[PDB]
Amino acid sequence: FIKVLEECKKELNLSESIINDLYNYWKEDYSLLNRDVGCAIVCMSKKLELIKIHHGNAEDLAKKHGADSEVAAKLVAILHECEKTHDAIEDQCMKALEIAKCFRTNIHELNWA
């Protein structure tokens, strides 16, 4: 995950700030997230074989991060609905940033780090 972040950082030539952005993303401050944060999430998603989003590998990643059967299913359900909502976004970098924000914001009522 750090492996995949570090790889993507070198491939896409991102500053150390991408760390600041993903931390901010996670604490639900989206105001300063730019397209490149989207490109980072596409890059990481591909390397984790999460990419259209792959349902099965999503559930695997979720359990892999300590999600039980029930919560993993809820997470991927929320991720799919976000993916549908923003399916029509041209720019696949912007599409990923928007899905990621939709996802993070709508997983509120779930115990998952």
Author numbering: 12 to 62, 67 to 128
From the study:
Insect Pheromone Binding Proteins (PBPs) and Odorant Binding Proteins (OBPs) are found at very high concentrations (up to 10 μM) in the sensillum lymph of insect antennae. These proteins form a large multigene family of small soluble proteins (~ 15 kDa) believed to function as carrier molecules to transport hydrophobic compounds across the sensillum lymph to the membrane-bound odorant receptors present in olfactory sensory neurons (OSNs). Binding proteins that transport important sex pheromones are colloquially named pheromone binding proteins (PBPs). Here, we have produced a functional recombinant PBP from the horticultural pest, Epiphyas postvittana (EposPBP3), and experimentally solved its apo-structure through X-ray crystallography to a resolution of 2.60 Å.
The overall fold of EposPBP3 is conserved with other insect PBPs/OBPs, consisting of six α-helices stabilized by three disulphide bridges (Cys19–Cys54, Cys50–Cys108, and Cys97–Cys117). In contrast to other PBP/OBP structures available in the PDB, both the N-terminus (residues 1–11) and the C-terminus (residues 129–159, which includes the TEV cleavage site and the C-terminal His-Tag) of EposPBP3 appear to be disordered and therefore were not modelled. Towards the end of the refinement, two residual elongated stretches of electron density that could not be interpreted as protein atoms remained at the dimer interface (between the N- and C-termini of both molecules). These were modelled as PEG fragments originating from the crystallisation solution. The structure obtained for EposPBP3 is therefore best described as an intermediate form between form A (N-terminal extended, and C-terminal helix folded) and form B (N-terminal helix folded, C-terminal extended). However, the top part of the cavity (which surrounds and extends above the functional group of the pheromone) appears significantly wider in EposPBP3 than in BmorPBP1. This results from the combination of four amino acid substitutions between the two proteins (Val53Met, Ile62Leu, Lys110Trp and Ala111Thr), and from a slight variation in the position of the exposed loop located between helix 3 and helix 4.
